[PDB]
Amino acid sequence: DPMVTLSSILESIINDMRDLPNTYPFHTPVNAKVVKDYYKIITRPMDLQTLRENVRKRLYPSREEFREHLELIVKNSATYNGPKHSLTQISQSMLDLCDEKLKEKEDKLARLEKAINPLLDDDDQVAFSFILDNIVTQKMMAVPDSWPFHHPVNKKFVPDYYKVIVNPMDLETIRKNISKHKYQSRESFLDDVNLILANSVKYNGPESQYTKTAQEIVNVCYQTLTEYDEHLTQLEKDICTAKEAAL
């Protein structure tokens, strides 16, 4: 079972990260009854124990989902402790080692990932994802003053954001989803794109300039999808055939 082999590789990387110097503060979850403001600042807690348990729950079908959770450890430290704090440097040493090990095992990991999910090797899925990523970076992120929507909100800087917005979305998250080939057609992609605009209506109001910018992001997405409609329709058809074939 390639998921078992993959999981064993990921656990071995966790073992190697745990062994780096001074890493213990990251081995287990932050104790929010000692660090009483932790959840007022951090939205997505992560640590090596939780990461290992998730590997064992078979939550990571690829390098990328694993690495994304590992990177939260660093991002959270950068936010809470500071970008140059020794704890943030220590967390970064873990991520650097992970990247070394993933580099070394890249061909084996690719083989396992494609055995787990054959669409990662499908040329139509890859071409479709490439087009979506170019729409995001060249059209959507090029909208003037679109920066509020480029990344997840950092609760440190907007402390009530996630009390209001419980289903957040942003363009970086969409790009990460594209890189993982989460979207097999425009319908699921547009659900996430529209969530950006819905969240702006809710948090900022329907007449806010933030919402006008978000509306422009959505409108240039529709305009560009319409321009590429013929090609995208063919890719979506061939992806469906590949999806059904893998059965």
Ligand X SMILES: C[C@@H]1COCCN1c1cc(C2(S(C)(=O)=O)CC2)nc(-c2cccc3[nH]ccc23)n1
Q: What is the DSSP string of 119-172?
A: GGG-HHHHHHHHHHHHIIIIIITTSTT-GGGSS---TTTSTTHHHH-SS---HH
Q: Does 153 bind ligand X (CB under 6 A)?
A: yes
Instruction: Name the residue nearer to ligand X (CB basis): 125 or 211.
Output: 211
Q: What is the DSSP string of 43-58?
A: SS---HHHHHHHHHTT
Q: Does 210 bind ligand X (CB under 6 A)?
A: yes
Q: Does 200 bind ligand X (CB under 6 A)?
A: yes
Q: Does 144 bind ligand X (CB under 6 A)?
A: no
Q: Does 174 bind ligand X (CB under 6 A)?
A: no
Instruction: Name the residue nearer to ligand X (CB basis): 98 or 220.
Output: 220
Other beta carbons within 10 angstroms of residue 164's beta carbon come to: 12
Q: Does 42 bind ligand X (CB under 6 A)?
A: no
Q: Does 157 bind ligand X (CB under 6 A)?
A: yes
Q: Which residue numbers come right before each break in the chain (C to N over 2.5 Å)?
A: none
Q: Does 204 bind ligand X (CB under 6 A)?
A: yes
Contact pick of 128, 183, 189, 203 for ligand X (by CB under 6 A): 203
Instruction: Name the residue nearer to ligand X (CB basis): 202 or 243.
Output: 202
Q: Does 136 bind ligand X (CB under 6 A)?
A: no
Interface residues toward ligand X, by CB under 6 A: 147-151, 153-154, 157-158, 161, 200, 203-204, 210
